[PDB]
Amino acid sequence: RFLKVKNWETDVVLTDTLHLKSTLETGCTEHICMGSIMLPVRTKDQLFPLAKEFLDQYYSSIKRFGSKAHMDRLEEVNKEIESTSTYQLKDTELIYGAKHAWRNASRCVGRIQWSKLQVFDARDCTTAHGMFNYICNHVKYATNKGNLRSAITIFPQRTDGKHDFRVWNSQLIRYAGYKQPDGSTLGDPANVQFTEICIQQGWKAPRGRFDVLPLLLQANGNDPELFQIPPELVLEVPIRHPKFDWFKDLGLKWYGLPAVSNMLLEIGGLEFSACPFSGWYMGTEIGVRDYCDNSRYNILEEVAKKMDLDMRKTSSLWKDQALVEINIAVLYSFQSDKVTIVDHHSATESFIKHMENEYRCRGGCPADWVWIVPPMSGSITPVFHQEMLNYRLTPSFEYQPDPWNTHVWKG
Amino acid sequence: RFLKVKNWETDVVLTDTLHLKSTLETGCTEHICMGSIMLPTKDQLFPLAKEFLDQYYSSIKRFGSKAHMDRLEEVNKEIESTSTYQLKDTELIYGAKHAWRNASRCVGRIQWSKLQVFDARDCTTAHGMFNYICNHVKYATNKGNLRSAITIFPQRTDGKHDFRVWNSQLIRYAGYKQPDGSTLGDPANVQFTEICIQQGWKAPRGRFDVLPLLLQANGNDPELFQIPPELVLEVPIRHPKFDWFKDLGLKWYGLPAVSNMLLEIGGLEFSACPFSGWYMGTEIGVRDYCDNSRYNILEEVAKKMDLDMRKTSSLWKDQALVEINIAVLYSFQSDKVTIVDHHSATESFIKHMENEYRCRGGCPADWVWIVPPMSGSITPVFHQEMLNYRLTPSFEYQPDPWNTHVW
Ligand code: HEM
Ligand code: HEM
Ligand SMILES: CN(C)Cc1cccc(NCc2ccc3ccc(N)nc3c2)c1
Ligand SMILES: CN(C)Cc1cccc(NCc2ccc3ccc(N)nc3c2)c1
Ligand SMILES: C[C@H](O)[C@H](O)[C@H]1CNc2nc(N)[nH]c(=O)c2N1
Ligand SMILES: C[C@H](O)[C@H](O)[C@H]1CNc2nc(N)[nH]c(=O)c2N1
Ligand SMILES: [Zn+2]
């Protein structure tokens, strides 16, 4: 079978055969589309076909499908599964798996870079302190004095589901949020629940607007432990605007390294519940979402005031106007400090090229339009006009519930 | 089977049961989502009629009534006999309003019940169609105080006697390909601006030439008619800050009047049912003015603002895009022509959603279309989960007549 996508701006038509390799479910049906829904202990039974599917893909990619090496590896895995109930990935397979999970992330606009991921194998790790050490090295390596490098650190896979490694932070580096008795919020409103947990766990909060949160690290199903990332490892950028001199006086800054740490990496049926990864920011992530979401720092107002815009009628588009200047400031500050960042025009343009390349070399590129289109200026980017097919391929990054909701406390 | 949708800005969760009524297909499957794809006999007829009359008679609290049963009987009789049937005026109006109510891509549906329905089912000729269309335009325009309306021409019979409005909208600007290589006027209508000429139109080969109407009655050859200029409300576009803005020479029409869709009620097909409401500002300023395959003036505007157009990261396109949209809204508001900004419309839509979930058990919605083409995430709809499904009565897309016309 074939499915075709059309770019309504260029009339370029592409043919998807890759979606046929998709097994997992979308959430949609013939009668309903769940395309804008944010989110729509495994037995030996269902594990070998998953391992086999993976090993087939792996051996095809290295042009050794049906080889004796391919076949021996299948046999090896089979025996280990029926003997030990799970199996270990070779280093090669781990690296391949991690890159492909990223290549397969249909909501990621940054995928042109997928083949350049530095994989850090942390499967020999056994304690939270050990986790802290690995994560520190990840941060130093990824940061690279502002010349950011994509990386992922992979902690031991799940076994019985009772010995999970988890990073409790949603991102390695994030600012604290504090609910005040008067109802207002100090710092990042997105991080209030997590900040509270940390504080309870014994964290001494400075209680400022930009306190970098401690790491809360869980090894082998044990109670999580608190660690402070050395501040010299946390690259930060003071936000200023190139024409507006008052902008620096808003007192804003942001961290340089986006490092998502709460996702689950699935490879050949194995589950890596702790797999923090990092790339670099698209400016809108900070400038639109982090600063201007009503449920975040929400500084549109104060910015708009200082711009002396007509804030009386929404049809003045003061909100839109302040949004742009804020995003200008984010990009300006980062470039000025030589910290890797990409604007949404550059990123989307790159993604279209990646996407076309993927259709040709791979037979498709799964892509989630709802997430791929930038949160501002949508139609003036080329992805807006691009039809996309969304489907699930493995290896993959999956959501998992927050650990504080599932964890059995030891004390 | 009972679905919930969460708003992530407010944590408001709504429960959808309305989707269980859904009858048509979405394009998606369990293995693939097609959410961003733009377009993915006697026997057939009676259940379709029945389903409609059921929901109609329920809507007036007369489900399970003599009238209901009798109407069902009567329609059933008429089908067995005539191989089709005719809607009562009441059912026609209800059907039209509900097609709009069910338009999952329409952000403006809070106004769905206030639609003025014009029954043009007695029409027999293009001249007649022209008359009905002029009346629609004048009524809807209302000297700038726009009123929503739909005009419904005779239903399909056997696909041979089709009533069609060949324009995509009643009022659109011409587009001609130059030898220069570029395009004068509107690039989207170049093919149509051609067909008008090819069927006899005299283009003023200007830029903002209001296109003539191309009207097709009873399956016959389509005819050209010029809408009286005094019926075409236009708005000159100026900026409330940049006085150089006027010299760009931009204007736009006040009346968005979509004329190429198919209206389906109770199994019956209305191939000609032009309808109109009023613009959201971004339709003109973001899409019409700044789309690359359209008027594409971003560059020119940025120049006049002397923005650093050297690197993308200066966000010059973004800055210009805003100013343009500020001007659009400004011009329309100044000239007292109805228009809505994307903030007001999306906020209205969230409230309409809440109303629909309350009084109806849900509201089919296409996030890809509902989220405005600029400043998406600072509008409430961006953070709103939506469920997309097809309900009937509905507006459907249909093939362009020229690819089909048995001349
Ligand atoms: C290197 C530069 C990168 C850029 C510019 C980038 C950009 C983005 C953006 C803007 C999003 C949307 C998230 C949001 O707006 O909330 C996203 C999602 C995502 N990215 Fe990338 N990314 C990069 C690297 C990576 C890497 C290295 C990985 C993994 C190894 C990755 C995996 C993912 C995944 C799994 C999602 C989906 C997350 C979700 O479903 O919530 N990305 N990316
Ligand atoms: C009264 C004020 C109205 C507003 C502000 C409004 C707004 C919109 C917008 C912005 C779109 C997206 C289209 C695009 O971006 O190109 C849309 C789609 C749509 N609207 Fe509304 N609209 C209004 C009235 C109406 C009326 C009166 C009808 C029918 C009686 C209608 C039926 C539809 C349909 C069927 C679509 C989807 C068409 C498609 O799938 O391409 N709208 N509307
Ligand atoms: C919710 N968790 C998946 C963690 C989390 C917290 C806050 C924001 C996001 N965004 C998803 C996401 C995932 C990977 C990314 C990689 C690079 C980048 N610049 N942004 C990225 C964004 C993700
Ligand atoms: C090509 N067909 C889908 C019809 C067509 C032609 C031109 C534009 C559009 N946009 C869809 C559409 C439909 C109804 C609308 C009603 C009011 C409004 N402001 N925009 C509206 C926009 C639709
Ligand atoms: C490819 C994509 O489906 C296409 O550009 C859609 C996206 N969203 C849209 N949204 C609206 N309101 N109008 C449109 O024409 C489109 N076009
Ligand atoms: C309801 C909706 O699915 C939700 O707000 C999504 C929309 N698209 C998004 N797109 C990106 N890149 N990031 C997001 O957080 C979201 N949120
Ligand atoms: Zn879908």
CA atoms within 13 Å, Cβ hemisphere of A357:
11
- Cβ atoms of B96 and B121 within 8 Å: the answer is no
Ligand 7 ion: residues within 5 Å (CB): A 28, 33, 35; B 28, 33, 35
Closest atom of ligand 6 relative to the A374 alpha carbon = 12
Token duo for residue B237: 């576009």
Domain boundaries, chain B: 16-121+148-158+262-276+346-370, 122-147+162-233+397-401, 234-256+279-344
What torsion do the CA atoms of A306, A309, A313, A316 make, to the nearest 10 degrees? -140
Q: Report the top-level CATH class of B234-256+279-344.
A: alpha beta
Q: Is A285 in the pocket of ligand 3 (CB under 6 A)?
A: yes
Kindly give, in sequence order, each residue whose CB lies less than 8 Å from that of residue A245, ignoring residues fewer than 6 positions away. none
Beta bridge partners of B163: none
The b-or-e profile of A101-137 (16+ CB within 10 A means b, else e) is bbbbbbebbbbbebeebbbbbbeebeebebbbebbbe
- Cβ atoms of B83 and B379 within 8 Å: the answer is no
**Burial of B245 from C-beta contacts in 10 A (0-12 / 13-18 / 19+):** buried
Give the whole-angstrom CA distance, residue B81 versus residue B8. Answer: 54
- Cβ atoms of A120 and A101 within 8 Å: the answer is no
Choose among B35, B287, B377: nearest Cβ to A375: B377
The b-or-e profile of A297-309 (16+ CB within 10 A means b, else e) is bebbeebbebeeb
Establish if A352 touches chain B: CB-CB under 8 angstroms.
Answer: no
Q: Report the top-level CATH class of B16-121+148-158+262-276+346-370.
A: alpha beta
3-class secondary-structure state, position B399:
coil
Amino acid at B185: G
Phi, psi of B225 (to 5 degrees): -140, 140
Phi, psi of A23 (to 5 degrees): -115, -55
Token duo for residue A233: 């490892």
Kindly give, in sequence order, each residue whose CB lies less than 8 Å from that of residue B294, ignoring residues fewer than 6 positions away. B186, B187, B188, B287, B288
Q: Report the top-level CATH class of A16-123+150-160+264-278+348-372.
A: alpha beta
CA atoms within 13 Å, Cβ hemisphere of B123:
31
- Cβ atoms of B19 and B3 within 8 Å: the answer is yes
Give the whole-angstrom CA distance, residue A265 versus residue A119. Answer: 13
Beta bridge partners of A154: A121
Kindly give, in sequence order, each residue whose CB lies less than 8 Å from that of residue A68, ignoring residues fewer than 6 positions away. none
Of A343, A347, A299, nearest to A113 by C-alpha is A347
Kindly give, in sequence order, each residue whose CB lies less than 8 Å from that of residue A312, ignoring residues fewer than 6 positions away. none
DSSP state of A1: -
Long-range contacts of B99-104 (CB under 8 A, 24+ apart): B99/B263, B99/B264, B99/B265, B99/B393, B99/B394, B99/B395, B100/B150, B100/B275, B100/B395, B102/B364, B102/B390, B102/B391, B102/B392, B102/B393, B102/B394, B103/B394, B103/B395, B104/B364, B104/B365, B104/B366, B104/B369, B104/B388, B104/B389, B104/B390
The b-or-e profile of B142-160 (16+ CB within 10 A means b, else e) is eebebbbbbbbbbbbeeee
CA B274 distance to own-chain centroid: 9
Q: Which residue carries 């979509």 as its tokens?
A: B258
State in Å: Cα B234 to ligand 2 middle. 20
β-pairing, A151-154 vs A118-121, is parallel
Give the whole-angstrom CA distance, residue B236 versus residue B229. Answer: 15
Solved with: X-ray
Give the whole-angstrom CA distance, residue B108 versus residue B97. Answer: 13
Q: Which residue carries 């670099």 as its tokens?
A: A280
- Do B318 and A327 count as a contact with CB atoms less than 8 A apart? yes
- Cβ atoms of B35 and B402 within 8 Å: the answer is no
User: According to the 3-state scheme, what is the secondary structure of A356-390?
Assistant: HHHHHHHCCCCCCHHHHCCCCCHHHCCCCCECCCE
Angle between helix A91-103 and A44-61 (nearest 10) = 90
CATH classification code of A236-258+281-346: 3.90.1230.10
3-class secondary-structure state, position A339:
coil
Of B188, B193, B136, B166, nearest to B272 by C-alpha is B166
DSSP state of B394: E
- Cβ atoms of B17 and B362 within 8 Å: the answer is yes
Task: Spell out where B249-343 has E strands.
Answer: 251-253, 257-258, 262-265, 268-270, 275-276
Residue B140: count other Cβ atoms within 10 Å of its Cβ. 27
Token duo for residue B159: 């696909």
Q: Angle at Cα A200 formed by Cα A196 and Cα A202, nearest 5°?
A: 120
Residue A246: count other Cβ atoms within 10 Å of its Cβ. 11
Token duo for residue A44: 């030996």
- Do A379 and B375 count as a contact with CB atoms less than 8 A apart? no
Breaks (C-N over 2.5 A) in chain B follow: 40
Give the whole-angstrom CA distance, residue A3 versus residue B29. Answer: 13
Long-range contacts of A84-90 (CB under 8 A, 24+ apart): A85/A43, A85/A44, A85/A47, A86/A47, A86/A157, A86/A159, A86/A270, A87/A47, A87/A51, A87/A270, A88/A123, A89/A267, A89/A268, A89/A270
β-pairing, A225-227 vs A259-260, is unpaired
Beta bridge partners of A4: A15
Per the CATH hierarchy, to which homologous superfamily does domain B122-147+162-233+397-401 belong?
A: Nitric Oxide Synthase;Heme Domain;Chain A domain 2 (3.90.440.10)
Choose among B321, B382, B388: nearest Cβ to A380: B321
Q: Which fold has domain A124-149+164-235+399-403?
A: Nitric Oxide Synthase;Heme Domain; Chain A, domain 2 (3.90.440)
Indicate if A124-149+164-235+399-403 has the same CATH topology as A16-123+150-160+264-278+348-372.
no
CA B236 distance to own-chain centroid: 23
Residues across chain B: 407
Amino acid at A123: R
